[PDB]
């Protein structure tokens, strides 16, 4: 601790007085991830193995809530033709707790791959569907030219070429009727320099990339404060209180001492927060319990030592903490070790603070 | 940034992408801390007067 | 079913002021002894809410638009209003939402509902073994193509007929977040003749309905087959607005005060 | 005229004064 | 940034792309306004003295 002052002062000669060096902190001794048992598994493989999807504007969706979803089967690595994801892959999504999940399924063309992206425009992006800028999920694409393609074109799937206005992200228009194409309203049936807005795909197994269909699956993720009953392979991880640990509770990952409190929460209220809008007390997602989040102990380190030419005696002063582990004394400033307490009063030499001073004597 | 919580950025965006969002919190909180220190050094001159 | 009652007459809209009404818990986050300022869809203080009533020969059932969310305040004696019907066309052409209170639990179903002209849930013969339980359902003739179904926790409701001024008060807030339907519920006894009693109360979240259907209009299921009548009741229809409130939280997490900074 | 302990949880440390109020009354 | 005019950026680039150019204009004007306020606090101490 004397050498900590030497590197703090950037010199080998420590002058007589009190000097601040470092900051002590209690590190977490364990990791407690507490979540109840799993209910079912998400159809992660059924959306990829489905026989046929919907069109781009008609896209079908399967809503699966209460994450974590099924992490066992993961096709994110070299399974399909095109894998473009944001954030972390579903391999790392097993540690995240999301409220609702929207699985979108639609088939696009070759030149339409660049048009599918969050916050990006395009022919089918504006006129059919656009991914929202809040999209945290993965965009999966595979080459269906050996299946969905038909001789002479596949007209089952449809796409809207023209529309009176551009669709906002996360908006659905299924209308197949005849509407205004250009700037001149043609009053229904095609004519008067307008065009039939809906169009059929030309999927041909024998043509190039532009005419090749690509099955695209979009997993839309929504994170809220709602509780999550499934996180990772480890569920219970039996609770240990009165210790500094790394906790993950209802999808909230943090480090702090876990202490039981008398705080009364309403049945719909999952967790509280303090004046700083940070996690204060959370409730057990498994059983009925209310647990308080206590920050682990920390504070500043003060070194009380005389001059280098005096002696090597060093008195370490901890700021605002009581030392229960451990010449161990306690003052209003905190734990003070390496010094002796004299009931007599002397002139202040090296101030400790709170009306107490330290000195080097016999 | 995306979120003010540190555990969110580390658990959401990849380490190469997370360094960009964390740097946004560093620069803002650095200016916020330098603003407090600047105001305290000004109030220190008034209390000494 | 398809025949309206003989006592059915559309009553003129009347308006009245809602003192603190429109305040609710904005989220599920607990707070203690702090002042939280948030902006959501609220009913402003001292605003005007529509006043409808029903008696034993004036029975009004107009259809009102639903856009950004609404505020319902229902003062009751025998609990005349057992629920509401939601939807766009309010028929079997599309999906419809019904919240039915049977005085046991909250029944919520989304299906294709064939809509009778005068929704009615039969309650009769209170002389012997009354139980005040529903018997005939005249509300919908058939149902199919159900995209959603929900059953809430068991509740308690007093359906016994009473006389004198109003007693029970049930206030509801119906809003739509990205297709998700969230219902707020609060029940307290009051002494009321006409208008609204002056007071302050916060509404607790009741149920969450991840449905996603569009609703442009709403109506209650009425009652209290052309010879059927209704009891004495009054209810209030408000309209939520993007207002900012300052909420005062106590040590137990209940709102003891609210301030609308858009008024004065 | 606690807010002290609440701010000490976020890393804001309130340092105790060297001169106590009882010693202030003695100088007075 | 590209230009100091706000209407020039919104009417040219895309809404997702314009957020990058506008952020450069904001952070530049935050430090300039913070410099003036800091300069006034120091000058006010001399006037108060």
């Amino acid at each position: 601790p004397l050498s900590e002052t030497k590197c703090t002062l950037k010199s080998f000669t420590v002058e007589k007085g009190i000097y601040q060096t470092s900051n002590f902190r209690v590190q977490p001794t364990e990791s407690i991830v507490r979540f109840p048992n799993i209910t079912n598994l998400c159809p992660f493989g059924e959306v990829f193995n489905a026989t046929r999807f919907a069109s781009v504007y008609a896209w079908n969706r399967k809503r699966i809530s209460n994450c974590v979803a099924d992490y066992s089967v993961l096709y994110n690595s070299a399974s399909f033709s095109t894998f473009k994801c944001y954030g972390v892959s579903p391999t790392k999504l097993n540690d995240l707790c999301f409220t609702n999940v929207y699985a979108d399924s639609f088939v696009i063309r070759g030149d339409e791959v660049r048009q599918i992206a969050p916050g990006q425009t395009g022919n089918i992006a504006d006129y059919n569907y656009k991914l929202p800028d809040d999209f945290t999920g993965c965009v999966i694409a595979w080459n269906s030219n050996n299946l969905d393609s038909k001789v002479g074109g596949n007209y089952n799937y449809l796409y809207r070429l023209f529309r009176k206005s551009n669709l906002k992200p996360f908006e659905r228009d299924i209308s197949t009727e005849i509407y205004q194409a250009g700037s001149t309203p043609c009053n229904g049936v095609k004519g008067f320099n307008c065009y039939f807005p809906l169009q059929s795909y030309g999927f041909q197994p024998t043509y190039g990339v532009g005419y090749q269909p690509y099955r695209v699956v979009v997993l839309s993720f929504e994170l809220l404060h709602a509780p999550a009953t499934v996180c990772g392979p480890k569920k219970s991880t039996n609770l240990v209180k009165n210790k500094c640990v790394n906790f993950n509770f209802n999808g909230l990952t943090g480090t702090g001492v876990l202490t039981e409190s008398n705080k009364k929460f309403l049945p719909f209220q999952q967790f509280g927060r303090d004046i700083a809008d940070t996690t204060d007390a959370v409730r057990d997602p498994q059983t009925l319990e209310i647990l308080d989040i206590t920050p682990c102990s920390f504070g500043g380190v003060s070194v009380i030592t005389p001059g280098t030419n005096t002696s090597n005696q060093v008195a370490v002063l901890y700021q605002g903490v009581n030392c229960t582990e451990v010449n161990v004394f306690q003052t209003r400033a905190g734990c003070l070790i390496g010094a002796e307490h004299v009931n007599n009063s002397y002139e202040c030499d090296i101030p400790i603070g709170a009306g107490i001073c330290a000195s080097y004597q016999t | 940034a995306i979120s003010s919580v540190l555990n969110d950025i580390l658990s959401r965006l990849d380490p190469p992408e997370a360094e960009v969002q964390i740097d946004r919190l560093i620069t803002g909180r650095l200016q916020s801390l330098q603003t407090y220190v600047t105001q305290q050094l000004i109030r220190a001159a008034e209390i000494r007067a | 079913q398809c025949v309206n009652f003989t006592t059915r007459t559309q009553l003129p809209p009347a308006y009245t002021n809602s003192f603190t009404r429109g305040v609710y818990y904005p989220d599920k986050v607990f707070r203690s002894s702090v002042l939280h300022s948030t902006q959501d869809l609220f009913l402003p203080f001292f605003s005007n809410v529509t006043w409808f009533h029903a008696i034993h020969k004036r029975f009004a059932n107009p259809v009102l638009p639903f856009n950004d969310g609404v505020y319902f305040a229902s003062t009751e004696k025998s609990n005349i209003i057992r629920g509401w019907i939601f939807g766009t066309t309010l028929d079997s052409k599309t999906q419809s939402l019904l919240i039915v209170n049977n005085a046991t639990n909250v029944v919520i179903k989304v299906c294709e509902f064939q809509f009778c002209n005068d929704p009615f849930l039969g309650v009769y013969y209170h002389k012997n073994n009354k139980s005040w339980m529903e018997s005939e359902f005249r509300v919908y003739s058939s149902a199919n193509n159900c995209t959603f179904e929900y059953v809430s926790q068991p509740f308690l409701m007093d359906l016994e007929g009473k006389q004198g001024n109003f007693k029970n008060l049930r206030e509801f807030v119906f809003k739509n977040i990205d297709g998700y339907f969230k219902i707020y519920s609060k029940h307290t006894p009051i002494n009321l003749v006409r208008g609204l009693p002056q007071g302050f109360s916060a509404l607790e979240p009741l149920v969450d309905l991840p449905i996603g259907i569009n609703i442009t209009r709403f109506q209650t299921l009425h009652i209290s087959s052309s010879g059927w009548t209704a009891g004495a009741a009054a209810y209030y229809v408000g309209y939520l607005q993007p207002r900012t409130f300052l909420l005062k939280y106590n040590e137990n997490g209940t709102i003891t005060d609210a301030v609308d900074c858009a008024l004065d | 005229t606690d807010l002290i302990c609440a701010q000490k949880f976020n890393g804001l440390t309130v340092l105790p004064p060297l001169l106590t109020d009882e010693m202030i009354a003695q100088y007075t």
Side-chain angles (χ1 to χ4, degrees), chain A, chain B, chain C, chain D:
Chain A
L2 177 62
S3 64
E4 294 178 351
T5 301
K6 294 177 179 177
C7 295
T8 300
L9 296 175
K10 294 176 179 177
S11 178
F12 295 162
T13 299
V14 175
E15 294 178 351
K16 184 177 180 180
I18 181 170
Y19 294 135
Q20 185 174 355
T21 59
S22 63
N23 292 283
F24 61 90
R25 182 178 181 172
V26 176
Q27 295 300 321
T29 59
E30 292 177 350
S31 179
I32 303 300
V33 177
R34 182 176 182 171
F35 292 92
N37 291 337
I38 185 169
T39 300
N40 57 32
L41 295 175
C42 181
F44 178 81
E46 294 179 351
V47 295
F48 295 159
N49 291 337
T51 299
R52 59 176 182 182
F53 296 160
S55 66
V56 177
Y57 67 94
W59 71 96
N60 293 336
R61 58 177 181 183
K62 294 177 179 177
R63 181 182 64 196
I64 302 301
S65 63
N66 291 337
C67 294
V68 177
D70 186 5
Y71 62 91
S72 63
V73 176
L74 296 175
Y75 295 140
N76 61 345
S77 178
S79 296
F80 294 157
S81 296
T82 299
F83 177 80
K84 294 176 179 177
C85 189
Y86 296 138
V88 293
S89 63
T91 299
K92 294 176 179 177
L93 292 175
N94 62 345
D95 291 344
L96 294 175
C97 295
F98 297 158
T99 300
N100 290 284
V101 174
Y102 295 141
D104 291 344
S105 296
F106 55 89
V107 177
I108 62 172
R109 293 175 296 181
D111 290 344
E112 294 178 350
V113 176
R114 59 177 182 183
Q115 295 177 337
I116 301 300
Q120 295 300 321
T121 59
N123 290 337
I124 61 171
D126 291 344
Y127 296 137
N128 290 336
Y129 173 76
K130 184 187 292 179
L131 276 68
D133 58 353
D134 291 344
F135 176 81
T136 59
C138 295
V139 176
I140 296 99
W142 180 80
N143 191 341
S144 63
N145 194 32
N146 290 336
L147 296 175
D148 291 344
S149 295
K150 302 299 182 181
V151 176
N154 190 30
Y155 298 142
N156 290 337
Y157 297 141
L158 298 174
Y159 65 94
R160 184 173 296 106
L161 178 63
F162 293 155
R163 186 180 182 275
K164 295 175 180 177
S165 63
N166 291 336
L167 293 173
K168 294 176 180 177
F170 183 76
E171 183 178 2
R172 180 182 294 177
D173 186 4
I174 61 172
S175 296
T176 59
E177 295 84 357
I178 300 171
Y179 296 140
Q180 185 175 355
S183 64
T184 300
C186 294
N187 191 30
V189 177
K190 182 179 178 180
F192 295 159
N193 290 283
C194 290
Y195 294 134
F196 180 76
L198 181 62
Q199 293 299 321
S200 297
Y201 290 94
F203 295 154
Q204 188 65 56
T206 60
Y207 292 150
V209 176
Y211 296 139
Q212 290 177 336
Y214 293 139
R215 294 182 182 175
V216 176
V217 177
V218 175
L219 297 174
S220 178
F221 296 157
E222 182 178 2
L223 188 147
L224 295 174
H225 59 284
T229 59
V230 176
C231 182
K234 294 177 179 177
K235 300 292 184 291
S236 63
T237 304
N238 190 30
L239 179 63
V240 176
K241 294 177 179 177
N242 291 283
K243 293 177 179 177
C244 182
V245 295
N246 188 340
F247 60 90
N248 189 340
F249 291 153
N250 291 282
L252 296 175
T253 300
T255 299
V257 177
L258 298 176
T259 59
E260 183 178 2
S261 63
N262 290 337
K263 294 180 181 297
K264 182 179 179 180
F265 295 162
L266 296 174
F268 59 88
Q269 293 176 335
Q270 295 301 321
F271 59 90
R273 288 177 295 182
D274 58 9
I275 187 169
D277 290 344
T278 59
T279 299
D280 188 5
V282 297
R283 293 176 62 185
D284 184 7
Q286 185 174 355
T287 59
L288 177 63
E289 186 179 2
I290 294 171
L291 180 63
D292 186 5
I293 303 300
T294 299
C296 299
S297 178
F298 59 88
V301 176
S302 296
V303 175
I304 296 170
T305 186
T308 301
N309 291 336
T310 300
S311 64
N312 290 336
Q313 185 63 59
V314 176
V316 176
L317 176 62
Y318 296 139
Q319 294 178 336
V321 67
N322 290 336
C323 48
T324 59
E325 182 179 2
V326 299
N327 290 336
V328 175
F329 292 151
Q330 294 179 336
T331 59
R332 293 182 181 175
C335 181
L336 177 62
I337 60 172
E340 184 178 2
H341 187 278
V342 176
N343 291 336
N344 291 336
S345 296
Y346 297 139
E347 183 178 1
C348 184
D349 187 4
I350 296 170
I352 296 171
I356 296 171
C357 297
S359 178
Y360 177 78
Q361 295 300 321
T362 299
Chain B
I2 295 171
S3 178
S4 63
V5 176
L6 297 174
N7 291 336
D8 290 344
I9 295 171
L10 296 175
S11 63
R12 291 181 182 174
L13 295 176
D14 290 343
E17 294 178 350
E19 294 178 351
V20 176
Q21 296 301 321
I22 294 171
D23 182 67
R24 294 182 182 175
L25 295 175
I26 296 170
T27 300
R29 293 181 182 175
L30 178 63
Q31 294 178 336
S32 296
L33 178 61
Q34 292 177 336
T35 300
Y36 174 78
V37 175
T38 300
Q39 293 178 336
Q40 292 299 321
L41 292 173
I42 295 170
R43 297 295 181 190
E46 294 178 351
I47 191 65
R48 291 173 296 180
Chain C
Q1 293 179 336
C2 296
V3 176
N4 291 336
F5 296 163
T6 59
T7 59
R8 178 181 179 273
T9 300
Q10 186 173 355
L11 296 175
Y15 297 140
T16 189
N17 291 283
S18 295
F19 182 76
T20 51
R21 292 176 179 81
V23 176
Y24 61 84
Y25 295 134
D27 59 8
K28 294 177 179 177
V29 175
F30 176 82
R31 294 182 181 87
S32 178
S33 296
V34 297
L35 296 175
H36 182 62
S37 178
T38 187
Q39 185 173 355
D40 192 5
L41 297 174
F42 293 156
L43 178 64
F45 296 162
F46 296 160
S47 63
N48 290 283
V49 295
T50 300
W51 178 80
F52 292 155
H53 61 285
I55 59 173
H56 60 284
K57 294 176 179 177
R58 299 290 181 268
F59 177 80
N61 59 344
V63 179
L64 297 174
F66 180 83
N67 293 337
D68 57 354
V70 296
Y71 175 80
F72 291 161
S74 179
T75 183
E76 296 303 323
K77 292 188 295 184
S78 63
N79 290 283
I80 300 300
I81 293 170
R82 292 180 178 84
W84 293 86
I85 180 168
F86 296 160
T88 57
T89 60
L90 296 175
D91 60 11
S92 64
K93 295 176 179 177
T94 187
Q95 295 299 321
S96 295
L97 175 60
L98 272 66
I99 295 98
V100 176
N101 291 337
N102 62 345
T104 300
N105 56 32
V106 175
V107 176
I108 294 171
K109 294 176 180 177
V110 176
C111 302
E112 291 181 350
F113 287 147
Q114 185 175 355
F115 175 77
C116 298
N117 291 336
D118 188 4
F120 181 83
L121 294 174
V123 174
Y124 63 91
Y125 180 74
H126 61 284
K127 183 178 179 180
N128 291 283
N129 291 337
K130 55 182 178 182
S131 65
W132 291 96
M133 292 294 102
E134 296 83 358
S135 296
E136 297 175 351
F137 298 161
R138 299 289 183 267
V139 173
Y140 62 91
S141 296
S142 63
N144 56 33
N145 191 30
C146 297
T147 59
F148 178 81
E149 184 178 2
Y150 177 78
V151 175
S152 178
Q153 295 300 321
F155 293 156
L156 296 175
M157 183 177 284
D158 186 5
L159 295 175
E160 183 178 2
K162 294 176 179 177
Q163 294 300 321
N165 61 345
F166 296 158
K167 294 177 179 177
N168 291 283
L169 176 62
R170 292 179 64 85
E171 295 177 351
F172 294 158
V173 175
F174 296 156
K175 61 181 294 180
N176 188 29
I177 296 171
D178 291 343
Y180 296 141
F181 296 158
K182 186 183 292 179
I183 292 172
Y184 298 133
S185 178
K186 179 62 174 172
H187 183 197
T188 186
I190 61 171
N191 290 283
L192 177 63
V193 176
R194 60 176 182 182
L196 291 173
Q198 185 173 355
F200 179 80
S201 178
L203 277 68
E204 295 178 351
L206 181 62
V207 296
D208 291 344
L209 297 176
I211 298 169
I213 61 173
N214 291 337
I215 295 169
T216 60
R217 287 174 294 180
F218 57 87
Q219 187 174 355
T220 185
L221 59 81
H222 297 291
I223 189 174
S224 63
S225 64
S226 63
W228 293 96
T229 59
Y235 63 91
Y236 298 88
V237 175
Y239 295 138
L240 296 175
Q241 293 179 337
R243 299 295 182 190
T244 299
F245 292 166
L246 177 63
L247 297 175
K248 182 178 179 180
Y249 296 135
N250 58 32
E251 294 178 351
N252 290 337
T254 301
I255 296 172
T256 59
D257 187 5
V259 174
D260 186 4
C261 293
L263 177 63
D264 291 344
Chain D
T1 59
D2 187 5
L3 295 175
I4 295 171
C5 296
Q7 294 176 337
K8 290 166 62 181
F9 296 159
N10 291 283
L12 276 66
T13 300
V14 176
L15 296 175
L18 174 61
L19 181 63
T20 59
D21 290 344
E22 295 301 321
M23 294 177 182
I24 293 170
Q26 185 64 59
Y27 294 142
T28 299

